[PDB]
Amino acid sequence: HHAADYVLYKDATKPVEDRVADLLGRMTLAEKIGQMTQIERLVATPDVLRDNFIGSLLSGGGSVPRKGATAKEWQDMVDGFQKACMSTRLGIPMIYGIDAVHGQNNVYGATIFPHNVGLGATRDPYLVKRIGEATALEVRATGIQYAFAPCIAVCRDPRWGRCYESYSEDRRIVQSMTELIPGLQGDVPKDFTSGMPFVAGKNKVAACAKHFVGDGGTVDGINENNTIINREGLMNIHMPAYKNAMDKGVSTVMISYSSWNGVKMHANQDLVTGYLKDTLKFKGFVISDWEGIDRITTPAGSDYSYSVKASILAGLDMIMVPNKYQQFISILTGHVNGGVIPMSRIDDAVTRILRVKFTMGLFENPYADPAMAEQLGKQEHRDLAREAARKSLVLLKNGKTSTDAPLLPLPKKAPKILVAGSHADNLGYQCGGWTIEWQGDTGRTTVGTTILEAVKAAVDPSTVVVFAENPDAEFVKSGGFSYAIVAVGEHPYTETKGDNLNLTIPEPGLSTVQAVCGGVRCATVLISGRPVVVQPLLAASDALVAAWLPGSEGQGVTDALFGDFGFTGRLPRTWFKSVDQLPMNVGDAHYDPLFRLGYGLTTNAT
Ligand SMILES: *[C@@H]1O[C@H](CO)[C@@H](O)[C@H](O)[C@H]1NC(C)=O
Ligand SMILES: *[C@@H]1O[C@H](CO)[C@@H](O)[C@H](O)[C@H]1NC(C)=O
Ligand SMILES: *[C@@H]1O[C@H](CO)[C@@H](O)[C@H](O)[C@H]1NC(C)=O
């Protein structure tokens, strides 16, 4: 189709399957295995990317070109890696992936949306679609083309450190929130075939349904552990949202570290090939988790040759190595040359990776668009995050007795008010894990508005706002306050660091709520990733709000506290009476919640 040097896979007018087959038929085994290899930016250089024919890069949590880097700095980093990949013999562009799981959350100045538990409280799938749309724009502002989201885990035990990454313990709510996918990727056309990958073009990103499968069903909520459940239960609880993801054209699926009835997911051919590929007809690419194949063995990493064979024969397509790429490539090449892994398996993995890259337009637009840098932290997206934070809040109490005046909404005009607690003026605590650092962090880690700053922006100019992080009761009683807002809760955590058998918030938290509420009427704002022991906090408080991990836009909290909007959120999880009840889900003989799934009080706007 015309120039003397015409090569069909470079022709943007040709169907994707024809371009995939044309390119695959030209590739050496080194070029094929390179496509299957994803490496961390920290081990990448131009020569490494070219010499090893690398297919993908990622940033892990906190892996950034520098602290405070601008959107342009991110684009220049991604473009520098892409120029090396485009300089190989075949010029196959890399795809760059990142955990953009509540906005583009590793990046300074990105909008930080509420984490998924609070989004489940909104029961609003169109809000979540709009969040996917804004997230895709902020990820593309940094030159990145691929987000590892949504987590469609159905968390069945809140002792799991990833419970906050699950929309709900009710798979129907998780299924509804798969609307994140067409937000991130764009809507699929009317005649679309379920299981095909889709991305609309350069203003959207590839998505990732994760972690396949049963990551929210592990014993005692131990992260990465064993999910013990019959096939009926796996299929009725943990699997359904993957079918919704197929129908919405999710481009990739990431495998879980967890096991199902003792079989590692990263080595489970029956489920990855037999079910996901051969039954659901998934035609995008399957990616490992970070060192997921290493963790097939006990101890992890003790037989990496086996890890490679087991994972590739199970049906995984791309391996998040992410550091020991030379060993990964050498071992896989040896297995293929030895006849241990057939070429048909390599060709299927490369077909799927190429299919996603061609479909999303990566060969046509391999480089960043500098005009997109301005989308990062845009005020329209902050207004959306503020809407989502307010909708996520669940009002659990609003008066100590049935005859008390309702405390919320609070008046904006009062002579003097108190804002108190470790979480009232701490942006890192209100964002939680996966924000700037992998585990999150404390203090003013990015651009946003704390609860204290939100109160100061809300109240009448005559209202004096006093801040005290941990006042004693005497200070409160002597202060001439009309009321207090006191915010406390969990510290940031991610993955195994968040596994927690006691679910009791760190002190001082309860002590501060008791001191403040003992001195003046108080609204307690509980920041957490999950239900936590709450009876003592409730006993002390006039009103109590479960705010989850609401992100950078603390005005979503004050929008409800001062009655600009009514409270509407409803619990997306069961609130237990005691951790000795766990696991405790609807239907269990022992179901005896403090607050049931779906519970929430309301207010009317003033
Ligand atoms: C579950 O956790 C235990 C205790 O740490 C560990 O020894 C075991 O390997 C884990 N099992 C799985 C399937 O990950
Ligand atoms: C609860 O568990 C967490 C996470 O393991 C731990 O850091 C904390 O100290 C524990 N709190 C207790 C035992 O009161
Ligand atoms: C809010 O308004 C409705 C009338 O539209 C009323 O029925 C309801 O009781 C009001 N207040 C609360 C706290 O629900």
> d(Cα 320, Cα 97) in Å, to the nearest integer?
10
Which residue pairs, CB below 8 angstroms and at least 24 apart, start in 590-598? 594/534, 594/535, 595/396, 595/571, 596/571, 597/169, 597/170, 597/571, 597/572, 597/573, 598/570, 598/571
State the closest ligand 1 atom to the C-alpha of 257, by its place in the atom list counted from 1.
Answer: 14
Containing 72, the helix (H) or strand (E) segment is helix 71-86
Residue tagged active-site, from 495, 499, 542, 553: 495
Amino acid found at 21: A
Nearest CA, atom 3, ligand 2: 500
Q: Which of 271, 266, 321 is nearest to 298 (CA)?
A: 266
Q: What does the DSSP 8-state code read for residue 553?
A: B
- Asked whether 603 and 406 are in contact (CB, 8 A), the reply is yes
> d(Cα 228, Cα 219) in Å, to the nearest integer?
7
Apex 246 CA angle, 241 and 248, nearest 5: 95
Which stretches does DSSP call E strand in 445-550? Answer: 464-468, 484-489, 522-527, 543-548
Q: Which of 190, 486, 405, 148 is nearest to 286 (CA)?
A: 148
496 pocket-lining for ligand 2 (C-beta < 6 Å): no
- Asked whether 492 and 455 are in contact (CB, 8 A), the reply is no
> d(Cα 232, Cα 367) in Å, to the nearest integer?
46
430 pocket-lining for ligand 3 (C-beta < 6 Å): no
> d(Cα 162, Cα 5) in Å, to the nearest integer?
52
> d(Cα 43, Cα 47) in Å, to the nearest integer?
11
504 pocket-lining for ligand 2 (C-beta < 6 Å): yes
How many other C-beta atoms lie within 10 A of the C-beta of residue 507?
A: 11
| SS3 (DSSP) at 310 | helix
The arrangement of strands across the sheet holding 226-227 comes to 226-227, 259-260, 263-264
603 pocket-lining for ligand 3 (C-beta < 6 Å): yes
Annotated catalytic, 564?
no
> d(Cα 494, Cα 549) in Å, to the nearest integer?
12
> d(Cα 84, Cα 48) in Å, to the nearest integer?
9
Resolution, angstroms, 1 dp:
1.5
Nearest bound ligand to CA 496?
A: 2
Apex 440 CA angle, 437 and 446, nearest 5: 75
Q: What is the 3-state secondary structure (H, E, C) of 461-482?
A: CCCEEEEECCCCHHHHHHCCCC
Residue tagged active-site, from 169, 289, 387, 425: 289
> d(Cα 153, Cα 174) in Å, to the nearest integer?
8
Q: Which of 387, 432, 396 is nearest to 523 (CA)?
A: 396
Q: What does the DSSP 8-state code read for residue 78?
A: H
Q: Ligand 2: distance of its center to the CA of 293 in Å?
A: 30
> d(Cα 472, Cα 452) in Å, to the nearest integer?
19
Q: Which of 475, 476, 547 is nearest to 505 (CA)?
A: 547
> What is the Cα 131 distance to its own chain's centre?
12
> d(Cα 252, Cα 310) in Å, to the nearest integer?
20
Q: What domains are there in the chain, each with its CATH number?
A: 1-377 (3.20.20.300), 378-563 (3.40.50.1700)
- Asked whether 549 and 430 are in contact (CB, 8 A), the reply is yes
In this structure, what token pair is assigned to residue 579? 């951790």
Residues with CB under 6 A from ligand 1: 222, 224-226, 259, 298
The per-residue DSSP string of 148-201 comes to ---B------TTSTTGGGSS-SSHHHHHHGGGHHHHHH-PPPTTPPTT-----S
Q: List residues bridging with 488 in a β-sheet.
A: 526
How many other C-beta atoms lie within 10 A of the C-beta of residue 533?
A: 16
In this structure, what token pair is assigned to residue 132? 């996917």
- Asked whether 77 and 143 are in contact (CB, 8 A), the reply is yes
In this structure, what token pair is assigned to residue 409? 């909404």
> d(Cα 82, Cα 73) in Å, to the nearest integer?
14
- Asked whether 531 and 503 are in contact (CB, 8 A), the reply is yes
> d(Cα 275, Cα 153) in Å, to the nearest integer?
18
> What is the Cα 118 distance to its own chain's centre?
12
Q: List residues bridging with 416 in a β-sheet.
A: 464
Q: Which of 252, 157, 159, 173 is nearest to 214 (CA)?
A: 157
Choosing from 395, 568, 602 the residue with most ligand 3 atoms within 8 A of its CB, the one to mutate for a pocket test is 602
State the closest ligand 1 atom to the C-alpha of 295, by its place in the atom list counted from 1.
Answer: 14
Annotated catalytic, 437?
no
> What is the Cα 221 distance to its own chain's centre?
18
- Asked whether 177 and 167 are in contact (CB, 8 A), the reply is yes
Q: Ligand 2: distance of its center to the CA of 499 in Å?
A: 9
- Asked whether 301 and 288 are in contact (CB, 8 A), the reply is no
- The structure was resolved experimentally with X-ray
The per-residue DSSP string of 380-439 comes to HHHHHHHHHHHHH-EEEEE-SSTTSPP-PSPPS--SEEEEESTTTT-HHHHH-SSBSBTT
Q: Which of 394, 321, 331, 342 is nearest to 544 (CA)?
A: 394
